[PDB]
mmCIF file of all heavy atoms in Angstrom:
data_model
loop_
_atom_site.group_PDB
_atom_site.id
_atom_site.type_symbol
_atom_site.label_atom_id
_atom_site.label_comp_id
_atom_site.label_asym_id
_atom_site.label_seq_id
_atom_site.Cartn_x
_atom_site.Cartn_y
_atom_site.Cartn_z
ATOM 1 N N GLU Y 69 120.338 101.464 58.332
ATOM 2 C CA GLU Y 69 120.829 101.441 56.957
ATOM 3 C C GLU Y 69 120.093 102.504 56.088
ATOM 4 O O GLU Y 69 120.738 103.187 55.292
ATOM 5 C CB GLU Y 69 120.740 100.025 56.352
ATOM 6 C CG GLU Y 69 121.686 99.002 56.977
ATOM 7 C CD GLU Y 69 123.164 98.998 56.607
ATOM 8 O OE1 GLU Y 69 123.558 99.704 55.663
ATOM 9 O OE2 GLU Y 69 123.933 98.257 57.261
ATOM 10 N N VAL Y 72 121.105 106.299 57.474
ATOM 11 C CA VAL Y 72 122.446 106.729 57.079
ATOM 12 C C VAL Y 72 122.458 107.228 55.613
ATOM 13 O O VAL Y 72 123.095 108.243 55.367
ATOM 14 C CB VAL Y 72 123.602 105.733 57.379
ATOM 15 C CG1 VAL Y 72 123.695 104.605 56.356
ATOM 16 C CG2 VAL Y 72 124.944 106.463 57.494
ATOM 17 N N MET Y 73 121.754 106.565 54.683
ATOM 18 C CA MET Y 73 121.785 107.019 53.278
ATOM 19 C C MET Y 73 120.830 108.193 52.999
ATOM 20 O O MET Y 73 121.105 109.009 52.112
ATOM 21 C CB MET Y 73 121.609 105.875 52.259
ATOM 22 C CG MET Y 73 120.398 105.032 52.437
ATOM 23 S SD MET Y 73 120.364 103.679 51.202
ATOM 24 C CE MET Y 73 119.064 102.665 51.949
ATOM 25 N N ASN Y 76 122.967 111.253 54.391
ATOM 26 C CA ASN Y 76 124.304 111.434 53.834
ATOM 27 C C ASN Y 76 124.361 111.258 52.342
ATOM 28 O O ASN Y 76 124.042 110.185 51.833
ATOM 29 C CB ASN Y 76 125.304 110.527 54.545
ATOM 30 C CG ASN Y 76 125.347 110.788 56.022
ATOM 31 O OD1 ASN Y 76 125.979 111.743 56.452
ATOM 32 N ND2 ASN Y 76 124.537 110.068 56.810
ATOM 33 N N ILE Y 81 128.678 108.623 44.531
ATOM 34 C CA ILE Y 81 127.874 107.430 44.732
ATOM 35 C C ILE Y 81 126.533 107.716 44.086
ATOM 36 O O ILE Y 81 126.167 108.887 43.896
ATOM 37 C CB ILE Y 81 127.692 107.043 46.244
ATOM 38 C CG1 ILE Y 81 127.024 108.195 47.064
ATOM 39 C CG2 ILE Y 81 129.044 106.587 46.888
ATOM 40 C CD1 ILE Y 81 126.239 107.720 48.296
ATOM 41 N N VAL Y 82 125.761 106.657 43.803
ATOM 42 C CA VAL Y 82 124.367 106.799 43.401
ATOM 43 C C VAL Y 82 123.639 107.086 44.726
ATOM 44 O O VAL Y 82 123.686 106.275 45.648
ATOM 45 C CB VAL Y 82 123.805 105.580 42.614
ATOM 46 C CG1 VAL Y 82 124.395 105.527 41.211
ATOM 47 C CG2 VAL Y 82 123.978 104.236 43.363
ATOM 48 N N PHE Y 133 134.166 108.727 51.671
ATOM 49 C CA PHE Y 133 132.823 109.091 52.125
ATOM 50 C C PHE Y 133 132.147 107.908 52.849
ATOM 51 O O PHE Y 133 131.702 108.075 53.971
ATOM 52 C CB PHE Y 133 131.967 109.568 50.933
ATOM 53 C CG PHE Y 133 130.501 109.662 51.277
ATOM 54 C CD1 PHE Y 133 130.011 110.738 52.012
ATOM 55 C CD2 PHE Y 133 129.609 108.678 50.860
ATOM 56 C CE1 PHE Y 133 128.648 110.825 52.323
ATOM 57 C CE2 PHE Y 133 128.257 108.751 51.198
ATOM 58 C CZ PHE Y 133 127.789 109.820 51.930
ATOM 59 N N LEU Y 134 132.077 106.736 52.207
ATOM 60 C CA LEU Y 134 131.446 105.576 52.828
ATOM 61 C C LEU Y 134 132.137 105.155 54.119
ATOM 62 O O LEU Y 134 131.464 104.922 55.123
ATOM 63 C CB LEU Y 134 131.378 104.379 51.839
ATOM 64 C CG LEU Y 134 130.442 104.522 50.620
ATOM 65 C CD1 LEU Y 134 130.570 103.271 49.699
ATOM 66 C CD2 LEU Y 134 128.986 104.691 51.056
ATOM 67 N N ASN Y 137 131.472 107.050 57.165
ATOM 68 C CA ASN Y 137 130.137 106.760 57.692
ATOM 69 C C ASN Y 137 130.030 105.340 58.244
ATOM 70 O O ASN Y 137 128.923 104.850 58.471
ATOM 71 C CB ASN Y 137 129.088 107.018 56.622
ATOM 72 C CG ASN Y 137 128.783 108.493 56.508
ATOM 73 O OD1 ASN Y 137 128.213 109.092 57.427
ATOM 74 N ND2 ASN Y 137 129.286 109.145 55.456
ATOM 75 N N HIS Y 141 132.113 98.743 51.596
ATOM 76 C CA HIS Y 141 131.425 98.363 50.373
ATOM 77 C C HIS Y 141 131.449 96.845 50.159
ATOM 78 O O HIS Y 141 130.402 96.237 49.980
ATOM 79 C CB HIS Y 141 131.983 99.137 49.166
ATOM 80 C CG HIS Y 141 131.150 98.982 47.931
ATOM 81 N ND1 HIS Y 141 131.161 97.809 47.188
ATOM 82 C CD2 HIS Y 141 130.308 99.861 47.354
ATOM 83 C CE1 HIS Y 141 130.330 98.021 46.183
ATOM 84 N NE2 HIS Y 141 129.814 99.250 46.237
ATOM 85 N N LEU Y 159 129.725 105.277 42.155
ATOM 86 C CA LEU Y 159 129.816 103.933 42.693
ATOM 87 C C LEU Y 159 128.417 103.426 43.029
ATOM 88 O O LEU Y 159 127.609 104.184 43.554
ATOM 89 C CB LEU Y 159 130.684 103.993 43.979
ATOM 90 C CG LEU Y 159 130.879 102.711 44.801
ATOM 91 C CD1 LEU Y 159 131.483 101.580 43.950
ATOM 92 C CD2 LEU Y 159 131.758 103.004 46.031
ATOM 93 N N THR Y 160 128.135 102.143 42.721
ATOM 94 C CA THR Y 160 126.888 101.431 43.028
ATOM 95 C C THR Y 160 127.216 100.165 43.807
ATOM 96 O O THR Y 160 128.382 99.797 43.944
ATOM 97 C CB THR Y 160 126.142 101.010 41.738
ATOM 98 O OG1 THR Y 160 126.868 100.002 41.013
ATOM 99 C CG2 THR Y 160 125.874 102.170 40.836
ATOM 100 N N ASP Y 161 126.191 99.480 44.295
ATOM 101 C CA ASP Y 161 126.353 98.231 45.041
ATOM 102 C C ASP Y 161 125.241 97.318 44.564
ATOM 103 O O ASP Y 161 124.377 96.915 45.331
ATOM 104 C CB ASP Y 161 126.294 98.500 46.569
ATOM 105 C CG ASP Y 161 126.367 97.241 47.415
ATOM 106 O OD1 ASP Y 161 127.030 96.273 46.982
ATOM 107 O OD2 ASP Y 161 125.644 97.169 48.423
ATOM 108 N N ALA Y 166 127.315 96.082 50.485
ATOM 109 C CA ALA Y 166 127.672 97.144 51.431
ATOM 110 C C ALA Y 166 126.846 97.137 52.674
ATOM 111 O O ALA Y 166 125.656 96.805 52.640
ATOM 112 C CB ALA Y 166 127.637 98.515 50.759
HETATM 113 C C1 4OQ H 301 122.006 104.067 47.963
HETATM 114 C C2 4OQ H 301 122.958 105.015 48.741
HETATM 115 N N1 4OQ H 301 124.050 104.318 49.447
HETATM 116 C C3 4OQ H 301 125.034 103.622 48.677
HETATM 117 C C4 4OQ H 301 125.375 104.067 47.388
HETATM 118 C C5 4OQ H 301 126.376 103.445 46.662
HETATM 119 C C6 4OQ H 301 127.041 102.391 47.246
HETATM 120 F F1 4OQ H 301 127.988 101.743 46.523
HETATM 121 C C7 4OQ H 301 126.770 101.932 48.510
HETATM 122 C C8 4OQ H 301 125.743 102.540 49.240
HETATM 123 N N2 4OQ H 301 125.471 101.982 50.512
HETATM 124 C C9 4OQ H 301 125.219 102.673 51.564
HETATM 125 N N3 4OQ H 301 124.990 101.985 52.780
HETATM 126 C C10 4OQ H 301 123.826 102.343 53.592
HETATM 127 C C11 4OQ H 301 122.599 101.611 53.090
HETATM 128 N N4 4OQ H 301 122.797 100.165 53.136
HETATM 129 C C12 4OQ H 301 121.609 99.452 52.660
HETATM 130 C C13 4OQ H 301 123.973 99.797 52.348
HETATM 131 C C14 4OQ H 301 125.213 100.531 52.842
HETATM 132 C C15 4OQ H 301 125.154 104.156 51.650
HETATM 133 C C16 4OQ H 301 125.734 104.787 52.754
HETATM 134 C C17 4OQ H 301 125.743 106.160 52.822
HETATM 135 CL CL1 4OQ H 301 126.621 106.922 54.105
HETATM 136 C C18 4OQ H 301 125.152 106.934 51.855
HETATM 137 C C19 4OQ H 301 124.571 106.323 50.759
HETATM 138 C C20 4OQ H 301 124.570 104.933 50.630
#
Side-chain angles (χ1 to χ4, degrees):
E69 292 282 350
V72 80
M73 55 182 167
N76 302 281
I81 59 153
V82 288
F133 167 78
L134 292 177
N137 280 292
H141 191 286
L159 177 57
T160 68
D161 176 32

